[PDB]
Design a protein around this nucleic acid. Structure first.
Length: 207
DNA sequence: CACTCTACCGATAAGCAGACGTACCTCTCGACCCTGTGCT
C-alpha cells in the first residue's frame, strides 16, 4: 500500500522534472515537494491514493508557439481503447496541444493506433510508471542532451555541408528522446566530458 | 439496454529450419562404370 504511494510520488516528481526540462513552466514549489506533501495533497482520509487528482498541466516558459502540455496518470492499471479515447477527448476539450499519459502495467496495441489516428491534431506520448520512477537524465552516464532550435540545426548542417541522414542518429524510442519529447528531424546537441579534449559536443538527429 | 457467444484482427511467443568459422608457406600422394553389339 505505502509502496504504491511512494512509487507514484516518485513518478509524479519525475514527470514534473520532465516538464520543467522540456521548457514548460513548473513552479519551484512543485519541483521541491516531499512525500508527505504528496500524501496530504493526493491521498484521502483512508490514505487510498486518488488517481483522479494525479493529472496536471503546464504552460511554455520561453516559446509561446508551443501549446500547453497536459499530463495524466491512467486511473485503471492497464490503459485500453476506452481510456485512450477519453484522454483524447480531455485533450481536445481544453485545447492542450501536447499530452502525456502515464500507465502502470500495460497498454493495448489498438489503443496505440489511436495515437497515430490523432497525430495530426494532438501529440500524445505514453509512459510506464517504472519508466519515470527514476530520472535517467540525472544518471552519471547520461551526458547533457540539449534540443536545438531549427535555426541552430540549420546552422550546424550548413557549416558541415551535411544532409540530415549524415548526422549520427538517436532512436525515437530512446529513453532520453522520450524524456525530451523529441520528434523525427529534431537534433540534440550532447555535451560530454572527454579524456582527450576535456569537453566534446556531439550532435544526434532523431530518426 | 444489461448482458454473455462467438467473430475478428491483432499481438504473442513457439519451433523450426538455415547460416558462420586465423594468416602465409613447403612438400607427397591418389584419382568411373555398365552393357549393347559388331568382330571373327
Amino acid at each position: 500500500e505505502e509502496k504504491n504511494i511512494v512509487r507514484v510520488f516518485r513518478a509524479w516528481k519525475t514527470a514534473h522534472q520532465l516538464v520543467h526540462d522540456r521548457g514548460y513552466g513548473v513552479s519551484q514549489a512543485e519541483l521541491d515537494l516531499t512525500l508527505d506533501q504528496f500524501k496530504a495533497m493526493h491521498c484521502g482520509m483512508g490514505r487510498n491514493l486518488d488517481r483522479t487528482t494525479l493529472s496536471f498541466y503546464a504552460k511554455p516558459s520561453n516559446d509561446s508557439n508551443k501549446g500547453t502540455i497536459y499530463i495524466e496518470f491512467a486511473k485503471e492499471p492497464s490503459v485500453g481503447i476506452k481510456e485512450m479515447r477519453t484522454f483524447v477527448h480531455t485533450l481536445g476539450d481544453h485545447n492542450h496541444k501536447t499530452g502525456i499519459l502515464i500507465y502502470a502495467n500495460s497498454m493495448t496495441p489498438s489503443a496505440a493506433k489511436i495515437i497515430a489516428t490523432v497525430t495530426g491534431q494532438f501529440t500524445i506520448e505514453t509512459f510506464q510508471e517504472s519508466d519515470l520512477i527514476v530520472n535517467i537524465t540525472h544518471h552519471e552516464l547520461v551526458p547533457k542532451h540539449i534540443l536545438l532550435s531549427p535555426d541552430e540545426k540549420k546552422e550546424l548542417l550548413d557549416r558541415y555541408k551535411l544532409r540530415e541522414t549524415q548526422l549520427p542518429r538517436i532512436q525515437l524510442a530512446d529513453p532520453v528522446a522520450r524524456y525530451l519529447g523529441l520528434k523525427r528531424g529534431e537534433v540534440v546537441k550532447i555535451v560530454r566530458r572527454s579524456e582527450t579534449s576535456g569537453r566534446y559536443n556531439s550532435y544526434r538527429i532523431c530518426a
